[PDB]
């Protein structure tokens, strides 16, 4: 199948038409997405089959064909870009300064950008172009607007 580095839509035909349930990142021949996008299910790429290798419902992350590869981190200071990939619409960079998720276990970057659910798994970038995590898990605030964590996995 296609194993080129870059960002991918995740599609199903199980509903009406073709439907974009999420997004993901191919790097080093591993496919990275959010667990709620695939629920651990196998994926097809041309005739290629991708099988799940690692996942954790709590991190809401899953890798295919290999272990989690993306280790870059938000530095805590600089702006970042959501490389957003909405259903039926062209990949679009949105530059933003992340806020913060304060938790009993520590602080995580957050990105306040509101896109349809099928955008879950779109990657977040530092200025050098490295992926520092995935958009699409997080929370709805007072306003009714949506705020996502910068969700990053651990590399071995």
């Amino acid at each position: 199948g296609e194993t080129t580095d870059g960002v991918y839509r995740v599609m199903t035909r199980r509903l009406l038409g073709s439907t974009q349930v999420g997004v993901g990142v191919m790097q080093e021949g591993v496919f990275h997405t959010m667990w709620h996008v695939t629920k651990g299910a196998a994926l097809r790429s041309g005739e290629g089959r991708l099988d799940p290798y690692w996942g954790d419902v709590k991190q809401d992350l899953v890798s295919y064909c290999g272990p989690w590869k993306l280790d870059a981190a938000w530095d805590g200071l600089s702006e970042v870009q959501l490389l957003a990939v909405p259903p039926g619409e062209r990949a679009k960079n949105i530059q933003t300064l992340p806020g913060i998720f304060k938790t009993k276990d520590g602080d995580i970057g957050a990105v306040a950008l509101d896109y349809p659910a099928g955008t879950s798994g779109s990657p977040i970038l530092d200025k050098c172009g490295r992926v520092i995590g995935l958009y699409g898990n997080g929370v709805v605030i007072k306003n009714g607007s949506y705020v996502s964590a910068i969700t990053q996995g651990k590399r071995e």
Binding site: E2, T4, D5, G6, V7, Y8, R9, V10, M11, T12, R14, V21, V23, G24, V25, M26, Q27, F31, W35, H36, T38, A42, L43, R44, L50, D56, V57, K58, Q59, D60, E79, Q81, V85, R90, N93, I94, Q95, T96, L97, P98, G99, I100, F101, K102, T103, K104, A110, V111, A112, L113, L125, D126, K127, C128, G129, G138, V139, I141, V147, A149
Partner: protein, 39 residues
């Protein structure tokens, strides 16, 4: 059966659209991976 289609390269785009605010929020994370507002 889900399938993937390539949607672009992963690159920083100079003069991208700059929007969004930067809010500090107190959150809990349950066993199901669902974040919630701790107010």
């Amino acid at each position: 059966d889900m399938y993937i289609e390539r949607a672009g390269d992963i690159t920083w785009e100079k003069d991208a659209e700059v929007t969004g605010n930067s809010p500090r929020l107190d959150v809990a994370l349950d066993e199901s991976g669902d974040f919630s507002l701790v107010e």
